[PDB]
Amino acid sequence: FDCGKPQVEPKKCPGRVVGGCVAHPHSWPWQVSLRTRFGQHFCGGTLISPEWVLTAAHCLEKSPRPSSYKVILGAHQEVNLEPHVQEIEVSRLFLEPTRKDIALLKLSSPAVITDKVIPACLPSPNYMVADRTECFITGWGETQGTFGAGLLKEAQLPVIENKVCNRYEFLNGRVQSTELCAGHLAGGTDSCQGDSGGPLVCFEKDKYILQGVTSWGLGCARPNKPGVYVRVSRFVTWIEGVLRNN
C-alpha cells in the first residue's frame, strides 16, 4: 500500500457541516490513537512509516518514558476496538529540538501494513500548502456525549495562507512559518478539532499528504479565526533524518 492512499474512500465531510462527520471506518489508515498504559485515548498521531508516528510534543508531557505510551492503529472505535486493531508500544520519543512542538514516536515493532493501517505521506521539505487547499483534520476528540462520541471523526478545513492568517484580524502575526493555518476565516468552528497530535492531511494529486500536526496550543479555530497547526513540511528533513539514523 503506497502512503496516503486509503483503501476505503474517505467520505470527505463538506466544510459547511457543523461538527464535521464520522469518518468512513478506516478511511484514514494512518490515524493513530495514542494511549496511556491503561487503555486511555488521549492523543492522535499520524503513522508516517511502519515504525514511526508523528504527534504533538504536548502529547508527551505526562511522561518521559516511551513505555508509558501505546499506539493503537487501524481503529475507528475509541473504546471498543474492532479485533483487528494493532496495539504497539512506543520504544522511543524524539522531540523536535528547534520548536519542540512535535515529536516522533518509534514503535516497539513495525506496524503491519494492511488496508486499514497505511502511513500518510510526508510533504516535500518546505512545501507550502496553497491558500484554500482543502484538507481534513481527523481524530476522536475529548468531548463525550457529543456527536460521534467515541468515533473517528473528520472535518474539512481549507488552508489559510500565513500572510493572510497573520493579519491582525486573525492570528495577528503569531503564526510562524514553521506553522500553518487551517479553518474558515469566518463561520469556522468554535472548538479545538481532531486530537492533540492528530493529522491535518491534504489530498494532492494521487494521495493524502500530512501537511499539519494538530497542536491546540498554537491555536484552535474561533468562528472568525482559523486554527494553527505545525507545518510538517518545515520538519521533514529533521524527521527523515531521525528515521534513517534510528
Name its key features.
monomer, 246 residues, mainly beta, Thrombin, subunit H, six-stranded antiparallel barrel, six-stranded antiparallel β-barrel, 2 helices, Plasmin light chain B
Short description:
The protein has 246 residues and is mainly beta.
General description of the model:
With 246 residues, the protein is mostly beta strands. It folds into 2 domains: 17-28 and 120-233, Trypsin-like serine proteases (Thrombin, subunit H), CATH 2.40.10; 29-119 and 234-246, Thrombin, subunit H, CATH 2.40.10.10. It contains 2 helices and 13 strands. Strands 8-9-10-13-12-11 form a 6-stranded antiparallel barrel. Strands 2-3-4-7-6-5 form a 6-stranded antiparallel beta barrel. The longest helix has 10 residues, at 236-245. It is classed as hydrolase. The entry lists the keywords microplasminogen, serine protease, zymogen, chymotrypsin family, hydrolase.
Kindly give the count of domains. Answer: 2
Determine the N-to-C terminus distance.
Answer: 23 Å
Q: Tell me how many strands there are.
A: 13
CATH class of the largest domain: Mainly Beta
How much helix is in the residues? under 10%
Site (Cleavage): 16-17
Domain Peptidase S1: 17-244
Disulfide bonds: 3-121, 13-21, 43-59, 135-202, 165-181, 192-220
Protein name: Plasmin light chain B
